Structures are given as structure tokens and as C-alpha cells.
Amino acid sequence: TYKYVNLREPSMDMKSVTDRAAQTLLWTELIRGLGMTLSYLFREPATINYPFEKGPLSP
Amino acid sequence: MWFEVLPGIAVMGVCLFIPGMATARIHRFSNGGKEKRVAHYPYQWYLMERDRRVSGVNRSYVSK
Amino acid sequence: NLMLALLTNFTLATLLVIIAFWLPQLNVYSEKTSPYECGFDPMGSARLPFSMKFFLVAITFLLFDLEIALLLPLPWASQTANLNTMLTMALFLIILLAVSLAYEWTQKGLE
Amino acid sequence: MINILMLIIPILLAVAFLTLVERKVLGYMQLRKGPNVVGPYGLLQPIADAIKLFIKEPLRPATSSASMFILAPIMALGLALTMWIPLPMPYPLINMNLGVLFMLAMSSLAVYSILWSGWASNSKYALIGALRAVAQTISYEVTLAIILLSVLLMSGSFTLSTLITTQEQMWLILPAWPLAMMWFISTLAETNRAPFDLTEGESELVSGFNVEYAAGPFALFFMAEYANIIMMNIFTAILFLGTSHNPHMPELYTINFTIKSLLLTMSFLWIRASYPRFRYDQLMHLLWKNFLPLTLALCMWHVSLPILTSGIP
Amino acid sequence: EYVVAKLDDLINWARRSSLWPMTFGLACCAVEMMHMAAPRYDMDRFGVVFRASPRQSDVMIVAGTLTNKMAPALRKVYDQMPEPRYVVSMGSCANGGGYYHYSYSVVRGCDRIVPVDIYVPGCPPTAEALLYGILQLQKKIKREKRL
Amino acid sequence: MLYIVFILSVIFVMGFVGFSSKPSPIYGGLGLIVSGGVGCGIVLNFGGSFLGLMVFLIYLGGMMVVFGYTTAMATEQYPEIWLSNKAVLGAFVTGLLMEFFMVYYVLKDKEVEVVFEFNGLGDWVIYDTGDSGFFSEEAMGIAALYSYGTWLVIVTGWSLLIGVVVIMEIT
Amino acid sequence: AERVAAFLKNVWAKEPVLVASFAIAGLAVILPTLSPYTKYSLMINXXXXXXXXXXXXXXXXXXXXXXXXXXXXXXXXXXX
Amino acid sequence: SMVYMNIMMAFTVSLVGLLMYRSHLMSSLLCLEGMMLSLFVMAALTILNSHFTLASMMPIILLVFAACEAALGLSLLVMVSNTYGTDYVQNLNLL
Ligand SMILES: NC(=O)c1ccc[n+]([C@@H]2O[C@H](COP(=O)([O-])OP(=O)(O)OC[C@H]3O[C@@H](n4cnc5c(N)ncnc54)[C@H](OP(=O)(O)O)[C@@H]3O)[C@@H](O)[C@H]2O)c1
Ligand code: SF4
């Protein structure tokens, strides 16, 4: 079917080059990656402590 | 939940809070006026030496 | 006192080692091994040179560290001396360091 | 002297209570419950490790070395805990003639803890973790002094007492905009719990300064390695943060200074969980090849600024 | 008399509090041993912190099949452990071969190489059943040093 | 108790014996930290915190480069302890007699010296400097300067350019 | 354009940090020579006294008075 | 005078250290930085006691050049091991 992993260079001229250069000069996308686990901290953990709570099973 | 996270921060708000207050509040017993003099260069050092010499006698820093 | 401040921290640190040294004792068998971490007998016994790979980049640090030490006057010296005479000389050391790193770009090494 | 003893025992507790945060904040970052069983919120577990690792754990290395090895955990604590002394705080313990020079010298001397642990085991397996720890620290000592010099020339002299007074209206983050971003990376020069980090954590290679050490020396290493993380967090909160001074009321400063540092204390453990290791070769290419020409260009920029507009202490 | 008896329990409370496991990537049991780190069934800072290195850890969990090629390897790792050490053989392979047992390469039951204190019988060792392997360990530590 | 610098100078020579009496660049490497770090205290007690802590900045950093060749190149065969070898320990035992036997003559009267100058006691004379300057104090207080010695800035900048290019030709 | 605009965008595409290393360091040399504010900073640097004042013997001298507030020599009044 | 005699005695031991060679070549490069360390302490005490201010810049220049030779000699140590195996004073061909 072919999905293709290669993007064949997203940058071309002026507008497409400068924004791709801005993320490599400072960070931006790493701060975007930093914010990915920020929301993960905010949501409740799906944790079960054994001596009191028990896990799901089958008949 | 943050009700589990906040006691981990509150325990740090006591232990790390100590070195700031322990340095400042000890100046009451060590010196008369809750202040330790800054040395840097001999000019400020000489002012402390003549203070201890002039009628303070035993005390390093004392008013009048 | 600086001497009394440094020694009290150092003596308390070494005393904590003694607590962990004398209290736990029961048996010491021929059980401890040379490499550890992953297991098995050490194929590389004692010591062997290895070396290389970072030999050029490490040497350049010893050369560069002297210049940064010579850059340390900047915030502390520029108070009494004339600024216009200093401007030509203060930048001069920083410019030439970029020139040496420009020569470092043409084949950096194995690293 | 009472102040030094009131800056080791409560400080070792801060490195002890760090172990909570090291798996509570890091836990919620990974969506998992950390300390819970031992105490009310696992608060009795950090103090339990001191009973666990020292009193009962006995190891000494096999082939070993002579006096060195056990000299290294003494070098670990006795050079990293001394770093607390030159700190300006509200009031410093023996205010140095030049402040930051003692901070930069003893930090490089603290690197020796992981260096002497290479000769802890005579076997070659341990020294690979030491040789990797050389380059992951040796290169980053260059910029650490340069980025300091650009900030120091902007505000005051080397004295740490003047760095508090210089920030009366606004922080030093805004004038030193690219330089503040550098001190999230350059602070991780020492072997710290991070993504950039050094040869200390497991992941790919064997644990540096831990595979040779026991429990008792190895336990003493963590009380020094995690101590440096707080030290860099406070040091960033002096050079880049400030907000207010107030010499009359020390109470208003002590609360406000801790919140600024604690936000940075979370930020390094935020870095640790989020990103993979940068590799031995490619960390040497982040700096030196890419970041060193950037920092020197800003160093060139910060030389001209006091001459362009009056800025001399 | 009473202070001496309670101090021994205080030292034993430290092992009741926290024990660091070893990441023995030995078989399929090691995958369920990774499920102890997985949030749904967690011992992460409940009493277990993964760090590896046999020199630092207190408890080693033999997670799967051992062979004659592995018998000299695991033995000295147990010797590299600090003297207060506990071995939890988890799985049927760790108890005497899942199938195997009558095979040529597999060493039977780990006890031929290294002594075991707590046994876990489960092939696919369910994380629910695995939690006993650490909780019963803490319960078994009762008394040390009378004189 | 009156002596501050004199006790530190004993520790200074103590580390220097582990150089003539060769203990390998790891035990001999320690000397640059032990006697080097105490050697900063000799500079610091006389005055000038800048130049005193300047020794710490290079002789520890540059020693890491030396450490990058202790576990490399040549020395990785045997540790070679200065307490084991008969040829090494013989130089150390005669090395300590060059230092510890000299201190024996310091106590009571002036010490005997190979040089013409007498050592004497000198406790208060150890500083040998008056207060004099107050504002912008110490000769070391404004030590490093780009002005006056403008010619010295150029050649130091040249010598740190030469090395980088030269080492590239060698390797 | 041959190298002014054509070659500048090539530095932005591959290794973009090289642009900032030349531009920021380049402006650090040009600005202190052309801007009309640099001469003011040297004036205050010379005005600030490090050492104590020296008294000279007066015998027919212009622009010299007592230590009291009076118009003598010059005295700095550059911006408050 | 008094303090100078101890650091001069440290110089003489490091002087012998540069003239003594055993097995490895690494001892010389330690003693090269060692002898420069002893000269630096001697320079620091002489200039500061009888104050100079202008000539206190001179040991800072000396400290820069202290490792200038040491960095080049340590880089020469690298190429000897590449030609041979391990750097040895005992192993030489030229007459
Ligand atoms: N020096 C020699 O090698 C040598 C020379 C000639 C003959 N031998 C003979 O060979 C034998 C060697 O044995 P060993 O000395 O190796 O044994 P051991 O190490 O003393 O071990 C004996 C064990 O029995 C327990 N035990 C003994 N008496 C006890 C009491 N009254 N109450 C409670 N527990 C007690 C101890 O437990 P706890 O530690 O828990 O109390 C100990 O673990 C000796 O019996 C001796 O006659 C030895
Ligand atoms: S006991 Fe079962 S799950 Fe465990 S290693 Fe053996 S076959 Fe795999």
C-alpha cells in the first residue's frame, strides 16, 4: 500500500524555512513536548493499591 | 490528584525554609542589633576594628 | 572563620562513613567480584590503555580554559581604566577565540 | 559557630525529602502513584532509607584500590555540601571577597567524586562509566564560566551580595533572554538527574560511581549528587531571579525566595522524565560545535553594552 | 529489655518500608516483572524502586528460566548482593521449569544454584499474585538478633 | 595557633614529594589537588581572592585532561602504589627527611638553611603589610588590567591561537 | 543579488545557529563606534574617585576654590 | 625570609622530579605543571608583600603560559602511543 516515512523536505522559501529554523535555534517544540506531560500530570492516575483495592478479572 | 503532591511540597517548605531564617534570627544573640557586618575590603574592616577598640572593649560591634 | 566552616562540614561527612563501616558486620566470604554490574568473569583483567577518540577535544579545553581565566578581568577591571582604549583590547581576545574554533570546524576529529 | 551545623542537618533532610519528589512528581508525570504505603503520603519512607542503607548494608569492593575509593564519598559530600557556605541567601555564611569564584571552583572540584570512582575498581568495567563522565562534564565547564561573565559584567562584580541588590524592579531573565535558556542546559554539567545529564544513570550503560560503590558509599553519593540539583536551582534563582530585597524584614524574603527555587526544583525532574539521553558523542556536538559560537557572540554583545550605555558598579 | 527488642524491629522496619529489585531479563516472567512498574498494579515507591546494579539492591527477583550457561552467571550476582539479601523465584521456570524440567539445559528450581525465601508459582505471573511476592516478603521479616 | 600560612606550607611540600618519588599519575595526580588546593590558601591568606582562586580554576580543570590520559595511552598496566615499590618508597622516606627534619630546627631559635638567609620565627612578620589603602584596596584588588600592558594582550591572544592550529598538525 | 540574499537563506536552512553567531557578534563591534552615547560612559568613569583628594599649594591659580559648595574646576553635573 | 624557604624547598623536589624518569613519560608533564605551580606561589608572595598593582598582572600572564607548554607536551604524548603502543622512557630508538 505504501505509507512513506520520508517527508521530502517541508521547507522551500521564506516562510517555510524560517519557522523550521526557529524551532532548531531555540526550542519551541521541546516546550510543546514539555506541555504534553503537563496535562498528563493534571489527569488522575489509574492506580490500584493491593492490600485494600483489587484489580479487574474474568468469570 | 494534587492532594498527594502538595504534602511533598509542604515538607520542602519547612526544611529548605530553615537555612534562610536560621542565619538571620541568630544575629539577635551574636550581635546587639540583629546585624553582622560585611567585610569585603580593608576600609569596612578597619571600621569594625576601631569600634571594638573604642569603649566596646570585648564586643566587636556595639553602638555608642 | 573560613577554616572552621570548611572543616566542620568535612569532619561530619567522613564521620557518616564510619557509621556505615563498623555497624554492619557478620560475614565476608570470597564473594565480591571485579567487574560486577552485569555478571560473568572479567575477560579484560586489570588495566589496558583503550585511549583515543576524544584526544583532540580534551586537549583544546586545556588551551581554552586559560583564555576564559584571562576573560575574568572584564566585570572587575573596567572601573578605573579608560573604556575606549579597553574596547579594542577586550574584544580582541574574544574575536581570536572564534578564529581558533573556525579552524576547529575544518575536520574536528574522530569525536 | 552554630550556623554551619544549622546548614548541614536540615540540608541533608532536604536531600532526603527529595526522594519523595523524585518519584511523586516524576510519578504523576508518568501517571503512577508514588509514596503512599509507608507514611500518611509516604512521608516516613525518605527517613527510612537512612536506616536501610547505612546501619545494615555492609559492602566493600573486591579487588578494590587502597585508600582511594572510600576517599571518594568523603570527596562527594565534603565538596558539594561546602557549596552552601558561599550562598548569599538573605544573609551569607562568611561573605566572600569574590562570591561566584568559590562557587565555580568547588563545583569543578565536586566532579572528582565521579573521577576517583573510576579507580575504585581496578577492573576496566567501571572506568568506562568514568571516561564517559569526563567528556560529559569537561566541555560544559567552558560555557558555564562564559555565560556567567556576560551576566556579571551586566550586573555588579563577582560578589554574590551585589546580585540581590541589582534586581530591584525587574528580573535578569528579560535582558539575558538567550542566556537564561542556556542555564537550563549548562546547569546539567554535573552528573544530575536529567535528560542531558552525565554517565550516572543506568538506561544503556552500567551505573557510574554506583557499580563500584556499595550501598554505604553508594548511598553517600546520592546525598551529594541530588544535593547539587538544589544548589544549581538556588544559584539560578540568584543570577536570574530576585523580585525584592527588603533588609528590614527577612521573613518577606525567605518565603518569596523559596517559591522561586521550588518552581525550578520541579523543572529539572520535569526534564528527567520527558526526554531520552543525548549520547556521548552528540552531547559534545550540542555545545562546542553549536552552542559555543552562540554564547561567545552574546559574550561579545555583553562587553559592548556597559560602554554603549553606562553600566559599571 | 524493651528498648532493645523494639530497636531490632526498627531495623526490620526499613526492609518492611522499601526494597530495591533487580531487573533480571531472563524470560517472559520479566515482562510481568515490568508490569510491577506499570501504574495499574504498582509497587513504585509503595516499597519497590527499580535501579538495577547488584551492589546497591536488597532483593533479587529471578524472573524465568535458568540454564547451565546461566548458572555461573546468577550465582556470583547473588554473591555481589549485600549480606541482608532475599531471593524471590517467580514463575514455574523459577520453581523447576515451566515445561522443561526433564530437559538437558535447564537447571531445576533455582535452589540448586541460589537459595530462595519466597516462591511465586504463577506462569504468566499475574500482577495481582505478584504483589504478594513483596508484601509477604515484608511480613516474613519478623525478628533479627536476640543476643 | 598564631601561624596560619606556615602550617599550610608543610602540606604544600607534602604533596610535592609524590612527584620526585613517582607514584603514578593517579596518586601523583592527587598532589595537584591536595597540595594545589592548600597552595591556594597560601595565596589567599596573604591577600587577593581573585589570584588565589585562579589556581583552582585551571589546575583542577587541566588535571581532568591529564586524567583523560591516566586511564589512557600508557599507564594502564598496574596501579603502582608508592607504598609497595622498594625503589619508590626509598625516595619518599628520604623525601620526608628533606621536610620534617627541617621543621625540627624551626622550633626554638632560627632554623638552619642551605641558603644564606636565616628563617627565624616571624609570626606577626609573616604578613609584613600595613593597611594603607582602604577604598579599592590591595594591589591584587585591581590586579588584572588590559590598560598599560596593551602589548601583553596581543601576544597572549597570539599564543592561544598558535596552539590550536599547531596541535592539529601534530595529530 | 548574488551572495547578499541568495547565500544568506542557505545558512538559515542548514545549521541556523550560525546566523546568530555572526550577526550579534558583528553588531557588537559596529555599534560602539557610531552611536552618540559611548563618550558619556567614560566621563563618569573618570569622575568617580577611588583615591582620596590631594591638596595643592595655591599661588595665582584659576578655577580653584575651597572645599565648600562653589564653582570650582568643573564638577560633574551630567544627568542629575 | 620565612615563608619563602618552604616553597623554595618544594621547588627543589619538583626540580629532581623533572630530572628523574621511571617507566612512563606521564610523570614529567605532571612535574611541568608542578614546577609552574611552585613558581606561581613564589610570584604571588613577592609581588603582594611589596605592593605593585601593575606587576600583579604578570603572574596571571605566567599562569596562562604555565599550561601553554603543558598542553603541547600532552598532545605529543598522544602521537607516541600511536607510533608505538605505550609511552615509555625505557623504549627509544635514536642514538
Ligand atoms: N577453631 C577451630 O576451627 C576448631 C579447632 C578444633 C576443634 N574445633 C571444634 O569444631 C567445632 C567448630 O564449630 P564452630 O566453632 O565453627 O561453630 P560456630 O561457628 O560457633 O557455630 C555454632 C552455631 O550454633 C549456635 N549455638 C551454639 N551454642 C549455642 C548456645 N549455647 N545457645 C544458642 N545458640 C548456640 C550458634 O548460633 P548463634 O550464633 O545464633 O548463637 C552458632 O550459629 C567446635 O565445636 C569445636 O569443638 C574447632
Ligand atoms: S514460568 Fe511461564 S511466564 Fe515465567 S518464564 Fe517460564 S514460561 Fe515464561
Side-chain angles (χ1 to χ4, degrees), chain A residues 10 15-59, chain B residues 1-50 56, chain C residues 1-24 35 39 42 44 46 49 53-111, chain D residues 1-189 194-195 201 208 214-217 219-313, chain E, chain F residues 1-107 120 122 130 133 139-171, chain G, chain H:
Chain A
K15 284 186 273 287
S16 58
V17 187
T18 45
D19 72 319
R20 205 182 75 92
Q23 62 175 53
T24 42
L25 202 142
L26 42 148
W27 299 110
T28 69
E29 95 292 290
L30 194 131
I31 312 156
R32 193 176 164 267
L34 194 140
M36 279 294 292
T37 43
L38 200 145
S39 298
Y40 211 53
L41 195 142
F42 269 68
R43 54 170 63 91
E44 66 277 299
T47 56
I48 292 98
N49 49 292
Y50 198 75
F52 302 96
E53 288 183 64
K54 288 278 176 75
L57 276 161
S58 59
Chain B
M1 56 184 78
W2 308 268
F3 293 93
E4 198 185 294
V5 189
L6 284 155
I9 318 295
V11 75
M12 274 189 159
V14 181
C15 65
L16 213 143
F17 191 77
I18 291 152
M21 280 287 281
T23 45
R25 286 277 175 96
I26 209 87
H27 297 311
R28 287 177 181 178
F29 294 95
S30 64
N31 199 63
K34 205 189 175 182
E35 190 62 52
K36 193 183 176 73
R37 202 83 70 85
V38 199
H40 283 128
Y41 45 85
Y43 177 72
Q44 297 165 310
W45 172 249
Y46 186 81
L47 291 156
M48 274 285 282
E49 279 288 298
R50 67 171 292 165
Chain C
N1 287 287
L2 285 155
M3 281 286 283
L4 282 160
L6 287 156
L7 282 162
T8 42
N9 191 83
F10 202 87
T11 46
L12 207 143
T14 187
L15 205 141
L16 224 154
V17 190
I18 312 299
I19 301 156
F21 212 91
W22 284 95
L23 282 164
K53 306 288 162 184
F54 71 102
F55 60 92
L56 261 152
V57 204
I59 279 296
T60 47
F61 170 77
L62 227 176
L63 221 151
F64 289 145
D65 198 61
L66 304 154
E67 202 273 329
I68 318 152
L70 204 75
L71 284 172
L72 283 163
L74 281 159
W76 162 67
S78 60
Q79 281 179 303
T80 49
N82 294 298
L83 293 158
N84 274 308
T85 49
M86 197 187 279
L87 176 75
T88 326
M89 306 314 295
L91 299 166
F92 199 79
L93 284 161
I94 326 159
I95 297 153
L96 302 182
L97 201 83
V99 177
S100 61
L101 286 157
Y103 198 81
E104 278 288 302
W105 264 311
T106 168
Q107 205 72 58
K108 207 264 185 74
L110 227 157
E111 197 92 310
Chain D
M1 279 286 186
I2 324 101
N3 283 298
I4 299 101
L5 288 156
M6 285 286 281
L7 251 134
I8 305 157
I9 310 154
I11 268 79
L12 282 163
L13 284 158
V15 191
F17 288 128
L18 253 170
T19 60
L20 289 157
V21 190
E22 278 164 44
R23 266 128 206 160
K24 200 181 274 287
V25 171
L26 204 98
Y28 276 90
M29 278 278 284
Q30 288 151 21
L31 201 81
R32 58 172 182 173
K33 200 171 273 184
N36 206 40
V37 164
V38 187
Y41 295 96
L43 293 155
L44 287 156
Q45 200 168 1
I47 202 150
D49 293 303
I51 320 155
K52 181 192 168 181
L53 290 156
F54 298 99
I55 293 97
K56 202 78 183 177
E57 301 280 81
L59 209 140
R60 205 227 174 198
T63 175
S64 328
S65 48
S67 186
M68 274 191 284
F69 165 76
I70 43 152
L71 199 136
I74 308 164
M75 287 281 276
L77 293 169
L79 299 168
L81 291 162
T82 51
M83 286 273 280
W84 292 84
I85 309 157
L87 281 172
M89 295 291 279
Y91 284 97
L93 249 166
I94 310 102
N95 194 54
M96 284 291 286
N97 309 296
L98 295 174
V100 295
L101 254 80
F102 198 84
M103 274 291 289
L104 193 69
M106 297 294 279
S107 60
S108 60
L109 191 45
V111 187
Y112 282 90
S113 60
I114 207 146
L115 300 176
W116 301 126
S117 69
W119 279 88
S121 300
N122 80 350
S123 59
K124 291 178 278 285
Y125 207 94
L127 59 91
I128 301 155
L131 274 154
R132 191 160 285 184
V134 176
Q136 286 188 291
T137 321
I138 207 161
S139 294
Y140 284 83
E141 283 174 61
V142 178
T143 46
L144 194 71
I146 292 161
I147 312 155
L148 263 169
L149 279 158
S150 53
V151 175
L152 291 155
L153 184 47
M154 179 57 73
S155 61
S157 61
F158 298 115
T159 55
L160 277 147
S161 59
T162 51
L163 283 155
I164 325 149
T165 50
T166 190
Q167 291 159 294
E168 210 74 60
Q169 55 276 299
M170 299 299 280
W171 297 300
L172 261 149
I173 309 150
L174 289 144
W177 184 81
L179 303 170
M181 282 285 181
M182 282 303 296
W183 268 67
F184 284 95
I185 320 146
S186 61
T187 33
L188 312 170
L220 296 156
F221 264 92
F222 297 127
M223 301 297 279
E225 282 173 298
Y226 295 113
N228 291 305
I229 303 164
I230 330 152
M231 276 306 305
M232 290 291 175
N233 281 314
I234 295 153
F235 200 47
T236 44
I238 303 147
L239 292 159
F240 299 97
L241 289 154
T243 321
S244 59
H245 182 79
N246 284 297
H248 282 266
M249 283 271 93
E251 287 177 296
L252 291 160
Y253 186 80
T254 43
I255 307 160
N256 200 32
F257 190 80
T258 42
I259 302 157
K260 292 191 282 288
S261 63
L262 278 157
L263 283 156
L264 291 158
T265 316
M266 305 308 106
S267 79
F268 282 151
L269 287 154
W270 207 294
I271 289 294
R272 192 201 187 268
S274 297
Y275 319 111
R277 296 212 294 109
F278 270 111
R279 207 261 284 256
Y280 169 80
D281 275 359
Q282 285 149 338
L283 193 82
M284 296 277 273
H285 282 286
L286 286 163
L287 214 91
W288 216 281
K289 189 93 168 288
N290 191 277
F291 278 128
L292 245 168
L294 184 76
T295 50
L296 283 162
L298 288 150
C299 190
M300 280 275 287
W301 184 253
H302 275 256
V303 166
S304 60
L305 284 152
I307 304 152
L308 285 153
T309 42
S310 59
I312 295 147
Chain E
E1 293 167 298
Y2 186 81
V3 192
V4 185
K6 284 280 275 180
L7 195 79
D8 286 303
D9 284 57
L10 191 78
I11 301 153
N12 290 319
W13 186 76
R15 269 133 286 276
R16 203 178 77 95
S17 178
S18 59
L19 294 158
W20 303 333
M22 283 305 294
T23 49
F24 277 96
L26 283 161
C28 359
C29 268
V31 185
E32 271 292 318
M33 221 280 286
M34 286 174 182
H35 283 293
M36 282 280 97
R40 187 169 275 270
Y41 309 99
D42 247 0
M43 274 303 287
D44 181 66
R45 208 58 92 113
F46 290 89
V48 150
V49 173
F50 292 91
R51 201 74 83 106
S53 75
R55 211 141 273 187
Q56 293 186 311
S57 59
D58 292 57
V59 171
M60 54 170 279
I61 303 157
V62 185
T65 322
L66 281 173
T67 53
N68 302 312
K69 283 178 86 69
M70 297 303 282
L74 180 129
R75 180 66 197 166
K76 52 165 122 284
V77 168
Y78 172 72
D79 288 311
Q80 277 162 30
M81 296 277 280
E83 212 191 316
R85 58 211 193 274
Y86 306 97
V87 181
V88 183
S89 72
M90 168 197 64
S92 50
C93 288
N95 294 341
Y99 316 95
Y100 326 107
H101 196 70
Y102 321 98
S103 61
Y104 46 86
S105 59
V106 182
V107 192
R108 299 143 190 85
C110 304
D111 283 64
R112 297 192 199 274
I113 314 152
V114 162
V116 178
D117 296 300
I118 290 95
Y119 298 94
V120 181
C123 186
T126 47
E128 289 260 291
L130 221 166
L131 271 138
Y132 297 103
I134 310 146
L135 283 160
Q136 205 85 250
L137 211 174
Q138 294 158 327
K139 201 163 271 188
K140 277 189 186 289
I141 305 154
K142 294 166 186 175
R143 279 175 178 175
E144 277 195 63
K145 289 180 181 178
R146 186 166 278 271
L147 299 159
Chain F
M1 204 71 77
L2 274 153
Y3 299 95
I4 311 151
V5 194
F6 183 72
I7 317 161
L8 298 166
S9 65
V10 178
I11 322 154
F12 188 81
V13 192
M14 192 75 179
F16 263 87
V17 193
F19 284 97
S20 176
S21 181
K22 184 186 177 148
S24 297
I26 285 297
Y27 293 91
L30 271 173
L32 291 161
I33 296 102
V34 177
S35 74
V38 169
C40 304
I42 298 158
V43 193
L44 279 152
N45 275 296
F46 272 83
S49 60
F50 185 83
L51 196 136
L53 291 157
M54 275 279 272
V55 207
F56 269 128
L57 295 155
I58 302 155
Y59 285 92
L60 298 175
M63 179 55 216
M64 292 184 199
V65 190
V66 179
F67 184 80
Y69 301 116
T70 56
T71 43
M73 304 297 154
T75 50
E76 284 278 80
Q77 279 169 301
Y78 267 94
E80 284 180 51
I81 323 150
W82 48 291
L83 291 153
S84 62
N85 287 59
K86 285 182 180 180
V88 175
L89 199 142
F92 181 79
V93 76
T94 51
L96 57 90
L97 285 162
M98 285 283 278
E99 202 274 302
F100 286 92
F101 206 83
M102 199 179 77
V103 189
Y104 192 81
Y105 286 91
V106 178
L107 299 157
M140 213 158 279
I142 320 150
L145 273 141
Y146 300 95
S147 59
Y148 301 95
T150 52
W151 182 252
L152 290 149
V153 188
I154 316 153
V155 195
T156 45
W158 258 105
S159 60
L160 298 160
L161 256 174
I162 293 151
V164 189
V165 180
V166 158
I167 289 151
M168 276 282 287
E169 272 207 305
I170 305 156
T171 51
Chain G
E2 54 177 298
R3 60 184 76 178
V4 186
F7 268 89
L8 204 141
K9 282 188 177 181
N10 290 303
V11 200
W12 279 96
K14 283 188 176 182
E15 295 171 299
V17 196
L18 283 164
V19 189
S21 64
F22 277 94
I24 306 159
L27 285 157
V29 191
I30 308 157
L31 284 160
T33 51
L34 287 160
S35 62
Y37 212 86
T38 51
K39 288 282 275 179
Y40 277 90
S41 61
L42 206 142
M43 284 285 283
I44 323 150
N45 197 282
Chain H
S1 62
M2 177 60 185
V3 196
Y4 299 102
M5 295 303 291
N6 291 293
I7 45 168
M8 265 282 283
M9 208 72 174
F11 183 84
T12 49
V13 183
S14 60
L15 190 143
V16 177
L18 278 174
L19 305 168
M20 282 274 280
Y21 286 92
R22 285 177 195 272
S23 66
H24 315 283
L25 200 76
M26 272 282 277
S27 61
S28 61
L29 280 150
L30 296 152
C31 288
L32 277 155
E33 281 173 296
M35 282 266 278
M36 284 311 297
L37 194 93
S38 60
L39 291 163
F40 189 78
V41 179
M42 279 208 75
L45 265 71
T46 44
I47 293 157
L48 189 60
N49 282 319
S50 298
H51 300 268
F52 267 99
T53 326
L54 294 149
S56 54
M57 173 66 176
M58 308 301 106
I60 304 152
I61 306 152
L62 182 75
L63 147 141
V64 169
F65 281 92
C68 276
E69 289 178 322
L72 198 135
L74 207 72
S75 65
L76 281 161
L77 196 99
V78 182
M79 298 311 283
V80 176
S81 64
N82 284 115
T83 52
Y84 295 97
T86 49
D87 274 52
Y88 265 85
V89 200
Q90 206 180 110
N91 193 38
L92 276 141
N93 197 282
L94 270 161
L95 268 289

